[PDB]
Amino acid sequence: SSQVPDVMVVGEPTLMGGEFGDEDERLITRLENTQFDAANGIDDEGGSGGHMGSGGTPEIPMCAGCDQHILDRFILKALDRHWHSKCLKCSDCHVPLAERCFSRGESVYCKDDFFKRFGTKCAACQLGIPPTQVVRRAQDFVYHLHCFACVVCKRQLATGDEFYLMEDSRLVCKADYETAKQ
Ligand SMILES: [Zn+2]
Ligand SMILES: [Zn+2]
Ligand SMILES: [Zn+2]
Ligand SMILES: [Zn+2]
User: Fold this and answer.
1) Side-chain half-sphere exposure of 18, counting CA atoms within 13 A
2) Ligand 1 centre from 36 Cα, in Å?
3) How far apart are CA 134 and CA 136, in angstroms?
4) Cα 147 to chain center, whole Å?
């Protein structure tokens, strides 16, 4: 009975290959709003009719992330509500989100960081691993193609290469294992 101990070996690199799905989360809806005839939007009080009358408008829906209400043409409806163009930026990245949108933890986030921060990534440099790239994952967790190496040899381990997984997440060959602790 020759059964090797808790040992492993690098194999064919592969990834989850998903990149999330726009259909999953409710993306921003670019549509023409129907607020082109409410309150005093147009500058000055004129144009057809002459002198009109429109003061405060209570019980009116306010722009998502704003103090007043919407009254423009093109509006982005997302997160079960209408979110302005400039009022739809990532609270963290603060980058222009004029294409997609995301919500989580009572805050509007983007999909970019959702994959890295709220997804899978390298367990070495905390970098965001692509969606379907090509890399080898350590048993359960995933690692980098470059970061991958030995604690002593400091050399990457390609398919076929035998490496051990330390309790503190560390790659160690056979000879390095015993020499390391065992
Ligand atoms: Zn706004
Ligand atoms: Zn973001
Ligand atoms: Zn890394
Ligand atoms: Zn080694």
Assistant:
1) 13
2) 16
3) 7
4) 22
Distance 176 CA to ligand 4 centre (A): 5
Ion ligand 1 neighbours (CB, 5 A) are: 63, 66, 84, 87
User: DSSP readout, the chain?
Assistant: -----S-EE------------TTTS---EEEE-S-TTSSS-SSSS-SSSSS-------S-PBPBTSSSB---SEEEEETTEEE-SSTTS-TTT----SS--EEETTEEE-HHHHHHTTS---TTT-----SS----EETTEE--TTT---TTT-----TT-EEEE-TTS-EE-HHHHHHHT-
User: Rounded to an integer, what distance in angstroms lies between the CA atom of residue 167 and that of residue 162?
Assistant: 17
Token digits of residue 61: 């829906």
Domain coverage including residue 63: 1-182
- The experimental method is NMR
Ligand nearest to the CA of 178: 4
Q: Into how many domains does the chain fold?
A: 1
Structure tokens at 40: 């005093």
Alpha carbon of 9 to ligand 4 centroid (Å): 12
